[PDB]
Amino acid sequence: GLNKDQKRRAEQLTSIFENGTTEIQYGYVERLDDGRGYTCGRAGFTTATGDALEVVEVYTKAVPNNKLKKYLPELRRLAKEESDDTSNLKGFASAWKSLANDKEFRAAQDKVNDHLYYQPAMKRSDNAGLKTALARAVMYDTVIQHGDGDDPDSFYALIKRTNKKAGGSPKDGIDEKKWLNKFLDVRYDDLMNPANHDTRDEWRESVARVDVLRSIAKENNYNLNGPIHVRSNEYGNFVIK
């Protein structure tokens, strides 16, 4: 996977793309009008998909009868219905934010992020024969935004479309740097014109992350060494140690 420094750098890149800061935002909650209900915490866990539900389940197992327990029935129904409804979540956004610096709540987010996003990203990277830290970091960011579902905008859909355009994966012998450039092209196209119309506005405004990642490739920094300087018209300027 990613070593300690590389994984941190990958996460600070994602943090810029999600929240405009290298400091991971565990307390973030916002309705983006992308069909996903509330988008929450470090991974943008959403109430329509079930992943915010998973955070609250994990937190509730660790800390019974916490301030978010009462939201489980509605979070469960929203996941079942794949629903954008936030009208039955009064107080949820404030309660989530109030736990931004809580050790157990952050740990629950880290656990769900590891299980739903980091480990699947590293597994699919292994399946594709990816060897570079930068390519693995791109996969990690991709699954966080696109999800690991079966839909045409999903992480694995992008991998398969890239493999077809490139004539194979790096495991098949395709040059990994060329493959990753094609992957970034495929992801850009998906963000500009996703199959899911609900997410068009938000994803079109996120395409700059593709160029930030490509700029790392163009510096030939495939090991994701630091410091990294991000210079983005959309996001601003950042240093990542």
How much of the sequence lies in strands comes to: 5-15%
Largest sheet: 3 strands, antiparallel
Anisotropy-based shape: globular
Strand/helix succession: HEEEHHHHHHHHHEE
Beta strand count: 5
Structural class: mainly alpha
Supply the number of helical segments.
10
Distance from first to last alpha carbon: 19 Å
Radius of gyration: 18 Å
- Taken together, the total number of domains comes to 2
Query: How do the strands line up in the largest sheet?
Result: 1-2-3
Helical residue percent band: 40-55%
Pfam family, one: Glyco_hydro_46
Organism: Bacillus subtilis (strain 168)
Active site: 18, 34
EC number: 3.2.1.132
Can you give me a brief rundown of this structure?
The protein has two domains: 1-22 and 117-241, no CATH class; 23-116, no CATH class. It is 54% helix and 7% strand. The chain has helices at residues 4-19, 51-62, 72-81, 92-98, 103-127, 133-146, 155-166, 176-192, 200-204, 208-218, and strands at 29-31, 38-40, 45-46, 228-232, 236-240.
Report what the structure shows.
With 241 residues, the chain is mainly alpha-helical. It folds into two domains: 1-22 and 117-241, no CATH class; 23-116, no CATH class. The chain is 54% helix and 7% strand. The chain has ten helices and five strands. It has helices spanning 4-19, 51-62, 72-81, 92-98, 103-127, 133-146, 155-166, 176-192, 200-204, 208-218, and strands at residues 29-31, 38-40, 45-46, 228-232, 236-240. A hairpin with a 3-residue loop joins strand 4 and strand 5. The longest helix has 25 residues, at 103-127. The chain is globular and about 50 Å long. The relative contact order is 0.14. The PDB classes it as hydrolase.
